[PDB]
Design goal:
Helix content of chain B: over 70%
Protein name (chain C): V-type proton ATPase subunit C
Number of strands of chain B: 0
Number of helices of chain B: 1
Oligomer: part of a larger assembly
Distance between the termini of chain A: 68 Å
Largest interface: A-B, 31 and 29 residues
Number of helices of chain A: 2
Structural class of chain B: mainly alpha
Family (chain C): Belongs to the V-ATPase C subunit family.
Shape of chain B: rod-shaped
Order of helices and strands of chain B: H
Subunit structure (chain C): V-ATPase is a heteromultimeric enzyme composed of a peripheral catalytic V1 complex (components A to H) attached to an integral membrane V0 proton pore complex.
Structural class of chain A: mainly alpha
GO molecular function (chain C): proton-transporting ATPase activity, rotational mechanism
Order of helices and strands of chain A: HH
Largest sheet of chain A: none
Radius of gyration of chain B: 18 Å
Number of strands of chain A: 0
Chains: A mainly alpha (47), B mainly alpha (42), C mainly alpha (151)
Keywords (chain C): Hydrogen ion transport, Ion transport, Transport
Chain lengths: 47, 42, 151
């Protein structure tokens, strides 16, 4: 009843947290590539 | 209760989120360096 | 109704329902007896509500924590100490004040008697009066004796 529903909700929260883990890994992967263009611009052709 | 076990799994996944973000940041630094190296080598 | 934390059972809440089957572990009985407890568990709010105030017996209000009950007991001890102070030490102070007031009233009466004597005799201080607490017939006898100098 209520206990089983709470367990299902917490399992959904665990799934959401794991999805957030994967999303944060991909977010680091994208963000490291992001903002590199300006650094290369000031570092490579400015030099 | 199953709720306690599911909450423990949720806490484990929450910790794994912080773990995976930090783990992926270092590896993605390599991708950023690779893009910079391609731009330089050109 | 009040100060029910002193009889608390310390998932469960202070209810003491004075005149339940669910997936939650209702197989329990709280020790909130001075009242009685009912089968309830905090895993399901519905079970606790049914066992406390949903129907039938009503949940009795209690002090938030058993620490509140302990503080109430300590304040009761301090209040009893203050009342005992007011009833023994302040009572002795009141008795001393009553004795002082009696002495002051006697002094004022003596001053008034001296003034009355100065009015009815020589101005310099000189009195030969007396003070007592006789009955009404005693006052009549005193008046008969002192009718020579009556107001």
């Amino acid at each position: 009843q209520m206990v089983r529903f709470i367990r299902q909700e917490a399992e959904e929260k665990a799934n959401e947290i794991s999805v957030s883990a994967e999303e944060e890994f991909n977010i680091e992967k994208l963000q490291l590539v992001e903002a590199e263009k300006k650094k290369i611009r000031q570092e490579y052709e400015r030099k | 209760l199953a709720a306690e076990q599911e909450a423990q799994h949720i806490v484990a996944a929450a910790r794994n989120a912080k773990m995976a973000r930090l783990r992926q940041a270092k590896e993605e630094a390599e991708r950023e360096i690779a893009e910079h190296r391609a731009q330089v080598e050109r | 109704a009040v100060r029910d934390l002193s009889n608390l059972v310390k998932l469960v809440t202070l209810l003491a329902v004075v005149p339940t089957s669910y997936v939650v572990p209702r197989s329990s009985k709280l020790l909130y007896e001075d009242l009685y407890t009912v089968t309830l568990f905090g895993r399901v709010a519905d079970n606790f509500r049914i066992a406390a105030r949903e129907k039938g017996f009503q949940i009795r209000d209690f002090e938030y924590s058993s620490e509140a009950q302990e503080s109430r007991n300590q304040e009761l001890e301090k209040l009893v100490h203050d009342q005992e102070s007011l009833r023994s030490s302040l009572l002795q102070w009141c008795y001393t004040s009553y004795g002082e007031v009696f002495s002051s009233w006697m002094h004022f009466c003596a001053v008034r008697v001296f003034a009355e004597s100065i009015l009815r005799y020589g101005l310099p201080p000189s009195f030969l009066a007396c003070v007592l607490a006789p009955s009404v017939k005693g006052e009549k006898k005193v008046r008969s004796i002192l009718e020579e100098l009556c107001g």
